Amino acid sequence: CAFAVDAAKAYKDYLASGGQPITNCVKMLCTHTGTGQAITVTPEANMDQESFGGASCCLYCRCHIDHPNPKGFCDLKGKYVQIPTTCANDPVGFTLKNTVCTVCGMWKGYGCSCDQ
Amino acid sequence: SQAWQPGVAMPNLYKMQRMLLEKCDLQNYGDSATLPKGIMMNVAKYTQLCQYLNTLTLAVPYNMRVIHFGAGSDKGVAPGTAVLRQWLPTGTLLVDSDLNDFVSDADSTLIGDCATVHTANKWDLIISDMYDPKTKNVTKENDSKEGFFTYICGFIQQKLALGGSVAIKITEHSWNADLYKLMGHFAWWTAFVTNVNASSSEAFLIGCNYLGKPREQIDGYVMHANYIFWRNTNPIQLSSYSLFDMSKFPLKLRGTAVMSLKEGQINDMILSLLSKGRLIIRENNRVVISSDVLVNNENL
Ligand SMILES: C[n+]1cn([C@@H]2O[C@H](COP(=O)(O)OP(=O)(O)OP(=O)(O)OC[C@H]3O[C@@H](n4cnc5c(N)ncnc54)[C@H](O)[C@@H]3O)[C@@H](O)[C@H]2O)c2nc(N)[nH]c(=O)c21
Ligand SMILES: N#Cc1cn([C@@H]2O[C@H](CO)[C@@H](O)[C@H]2O)c2ncnc(N)c12
Numbered sequence: 001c002a003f004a005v006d007a008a009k010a011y012k013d014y015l016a017s018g019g020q021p022i023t024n025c026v027k028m029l030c031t032h033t034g035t036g037q038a039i040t041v042t043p044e045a046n047m048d049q050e051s052f053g054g055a056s057c058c059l060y061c062r063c064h065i066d067h068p069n070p071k072g073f074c075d076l077k078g079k080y081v082q083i084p085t086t087c088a089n090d091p092v093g094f095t096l097k098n099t100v101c102t103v104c105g106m107w108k109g110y111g112c113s114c115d116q
Numbered sequence: 117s118q119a120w121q122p123g124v125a126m127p128n129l130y131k132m133q134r135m136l137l138e139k140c141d142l143q144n145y146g147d148s149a150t151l152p153k154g155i156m157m158n159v160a161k162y163t164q165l166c167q168y169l170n171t172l173t174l175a176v177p178y179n180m181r182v183i184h185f186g187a188g189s190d191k192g193v194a195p196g197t198a199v200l201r202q203w204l205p206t207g208t209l210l211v212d213s214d215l216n217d218f219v220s221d222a223d224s225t226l227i228g229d230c231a232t233v234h235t236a237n238k239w240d241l242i243i244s245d246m247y248d249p250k251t252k253n254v255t256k257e258n259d260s261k262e263g264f265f266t267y268i269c270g271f272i273q274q275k276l277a278l279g280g281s282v283a284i285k286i287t288e289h290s291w292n293a294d295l296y297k298l299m300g301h302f303a304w305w306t307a308f309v310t311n312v313n314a315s316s317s318e319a320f321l322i323g324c325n326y327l328g329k330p331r332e333q334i335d336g337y338v339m340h341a342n343y344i345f346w347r348n349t350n351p352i353q354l355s356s357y358s359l360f361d362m363s364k365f366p367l368k369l370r371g372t373a374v375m376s377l378k379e380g381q382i383n384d385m386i387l388s389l390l391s392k393g394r395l396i397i398r399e400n401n402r403v404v405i406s407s408d409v410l411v412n413n414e415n416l
């Protein structure tokens with residue numbers, strides 16, 4: 001039996017169909033002079049970012065579903081996630097769709113300059 | 117002036133009065149602060165609480181242990197915990213808890229009545245934001261409330277390290293006389309009102325550096341009356357000003373010494389170190405917690 005709920009795809013499809021993004025992600029007060037790295041132990045938003053409590057931005061945490069990992073570990077819980085201000089209306093969608101550069105810790109496409 | 121502070125602490129002279137309890141009547145009751153864009157009240161409030169705690173002699177050891185009661189929200193997240201974890205040194209052990217299920221950034225979360233929460237470890241900081249919604253059903257004289265306040269008082273007396281501190285939320289009608297009495301078992305104490313919630317009778321009763329014995333005898337019914345008298349005669353203007361400067365927000369890692377000591381060894385020099393935020397007394401074993409689970413079979 002290969003059956004598995006695909007919550008990521010479900011939310012991506014829901015958004016594409018015009019659904020309102022998940023809300024009540026926990027935005028933090030911060031200096032907005034941080035490193036701008038994607039996922040950090042303390043808020044690190046730069047001037048172009050908002051910092052959020054990580055658990056509240058995790059689709060799996062918020063939906064009470066298993067994390068897609070054999071360990072079931074969460075890369076957001078207990079940390080802070082930096083979200084481009086232009087995408088801060090849907091932090092859960094942003095974290096789901098985007099990827100962190102393993103080299104510089106910036107979001108690929110939203111601060112990673114490794115490929116330039 | 118007060119509007120640029122994170123909040124207002126009850127002045128010492130009001131603590132020294134002998135007031136009778138009156139109804140609380142705030143001139144700005146019902147007014148709401150203007151918060152920064154997209155910032156929740158719960159984040160602003162806890163940010164201001166922590167900004168004020170930064171001005172006190174808190175003990176901040178390595179592998180500090182913090183427990184946070186009443187941490188869930190009707191949204192199913194834990195904004196307060198997120199602020200505490202931001203404030204506290206990275207690596208601080210943070211446990212939170214609430215009657216209702218929620219998802220949290222804490223290292224461990226227990227769901228259930230606080231009375232179901234157990235641990236044999238002692239804690240360096242206890243935060244409580246618990247409030248019984250039925251407190252709103254005011255049908256009689258405003259007497260000392262029990263419920264979770266009974267738990268919190270026992271938790272402080274049994275599981276708070278010497279040198280540790282507390283911040284326990286109260287309101288006009290959500291208060292407990294024994295909790296005020298226990299404020300006199302700390303080197304210092306106050307009732308702190310956040311400027312973002314200045315239109316509420318809420319305050320955080322803060323006990324700074326626990327001594328394990330009364331330094332001062334406090335009558336809790338009188339002290340609550342004194343608190344309401346202060347609030348009734350000192351309007352606080354709503355302010356969010358302090359939220360905009362977070363450059364000094366992080367709690368400084370003092371690396372406070374942790375020692376285990378027998379009750380006979382707590383001399384006046386030890387008590388002095390405790391009173392200055394320079395010492396924590398407790399075991400430093402692994403931290404273990406649990407939630408009591410009631411078993412029953414409802415079939416037939
Ligand atoms: C101080 N006060 C109390 N009352 C009356 O007494 C009752 C109980 O008074 P209280 O102890 O609840 O105090 P207060 O109203 O100041 O509390 P507030 O609603 O601001 O709540 C404070 C915090 O408690 C928590 N809280 C309140 N309600 C809930 C809830 N339903 N669920 C979870 N948390 C809650 C929230 O964190 C909130 O910020 C009030 O519901 C009101 O009829 C007042 N009436 C006037 N006209 N002027 C006042 O100044 C006044
Ligand atoms: N009475 C009572 C309690 C209230 N709360 C919580 O205070 C939080 C206030 O925002 C809320 O989320 C609530 O669920 C309690 N949590 C544990 N044990 C309790 N006995 C209580």
Ligand SMILES: [Zn+2]
Pocket residue numbers: 055058059060061062067074075076077
């Ligand atoms: Zn998660």
Ligand SMILES: [Zn+2]
Pocket residue numbers: 101102103104105106112113114115
């Ligand atoms: Zn990169």
